[PDB]
């Protein structure tokens, strides 16, 4: 039917609290798409991206989790957990590059 971005966000949070990261990603992506199309809503993109990035990381999609973390930081450069996540992903990527340069 029609769920608001806030509806989707709330459903995403229920999924997240049940450790259903598949449905977390679906609900949060729908919330983000509706916000990106200009829906007026009290939820902010930053919180949606925070749940989405975490859910995508749980699914093992590290590249997508990095991209979402960067998107979050563009919107909130001082976000503490996103900054931590980024340094972790950059460490891993630096390791991989070091490996390639020795082999």
């Amino acid at each position: 039917s029609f769920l608001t971005a806030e509806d989707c966000f709330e459903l995403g949070k229920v999924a997240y609290t049940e450790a259903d990261y598949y449905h977390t990603e679906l609900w949060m992506e729908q919330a983000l798409r509706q916000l990106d199309e200009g829906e007026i809503s009290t939820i902010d993109k930053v919180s949606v991206l925070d749940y989405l990035s975490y859910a995508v990381y749980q699914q093992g999609d590290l590249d997508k989790a990095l991209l979402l973390t960067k998107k979050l930081l563009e919107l909130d450069p001082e976000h503490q957990r996103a900054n931590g996540n980024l340094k972790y992903f950059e460490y891993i990527m630096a390791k991989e590059l070091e490996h390639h340069h020795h082999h």
């Binding site: 997240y16 919180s47 925070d50 749940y51 990035s53 975490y54 859910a55 990381y57 989790a65 957990r81 931590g84 996540n85 972790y88 992903f89």
Partner: peptide, 5 residues
């Protein structure tokens, strides 16, 4: 360790 909300 990536942290979530």
């Amino acid at each position: 360790g990536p942290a979530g909300p």
